[PDB]
Amino acid sequence: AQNPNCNIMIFHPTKEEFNDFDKYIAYMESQGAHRAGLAKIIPPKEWKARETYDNISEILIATPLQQVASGRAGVFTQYHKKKKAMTVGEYRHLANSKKYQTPPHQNFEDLERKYWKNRIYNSPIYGADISGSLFDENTKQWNLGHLGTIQDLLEKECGVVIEGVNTPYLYFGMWKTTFAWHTEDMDLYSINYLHLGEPKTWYVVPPEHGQRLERLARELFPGSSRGCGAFLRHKVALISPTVLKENGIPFNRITQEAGEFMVTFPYGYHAGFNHGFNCAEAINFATPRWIDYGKMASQCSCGEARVTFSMDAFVRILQPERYDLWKRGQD
């Protein structure tokens, strides 16, 4: 078995190898990359997502989210308070303010320490889940707005034709902005490109060990656990590396820098934080190996996680028994 310790792998494709996305994902899996739950892909030196970022300040963040934490430093939840709309220009200025900017630090490790020590005492503002793309339409390789769609993958593999579309989303982050422990909707893959700015640190649990994370989370958030049989779908719970180590949960960490792609694999729990002002683009995708994960994916039926028009059809076809009670939570 390749990569038996489930280490995060880093790949450096040539421009020639960067021409066939599906084939490269299959290559990475042949090398055991999926066992980690997360892989880094450094694009060929000749590749660019776009010519410049010089005119992005006019993008609107219609509902910036203030991430308010409750709990203790290593075990907390966050809630998103909606704020008034602001432009990317306005948001960047806020990120750079004395109140919100990245603190002095020695290196990524000192900054990680400061994050876990201090996150709960601040409420950073996140411009998340903004439909759009920053790839130039002439970028032909690894353009997240030109990928084959999940609906077309299900059609090719299973023969069924369903409604729905699949488009990317932009994320504008600042120091301490946080993504809680989650897998993707329907345990899909995701791909994330860090277009610009300061890094993003990721933590990931190997898919083969995901249930160990779930069991810990039920112990650490016991009322959440009673309210919903899949509450990590709410994307509110954080657990520090220290806590994971104290409880024997296998995990890995890696820092993504501007210009790099990350891939999350089916049922790879992941969480992380941003080091400073940045802009990422991400989208979910499928391969044939995903289909069995989609059939087995947990769902939130308490009604909190409340998910997309396109996810309806996935549940309908892959989880017909659930269909019924799941759409009761979504209607």
Ligand SMILES: O=C(O)CNC(=O)C(=O)O
């Ligand atoms: O970048 C973020 O805030 C969160 N992204 C993801 O969880 C992803 O790409 O799967």
Ligand SMILES: [Mg+2]
């Ligand atoms: Mg603009």
Ligand code: NI
């Ligand atoms: Ni994700």
Ligand SMILES: [Zn+2]
């Ligand atoms: Zn729920």
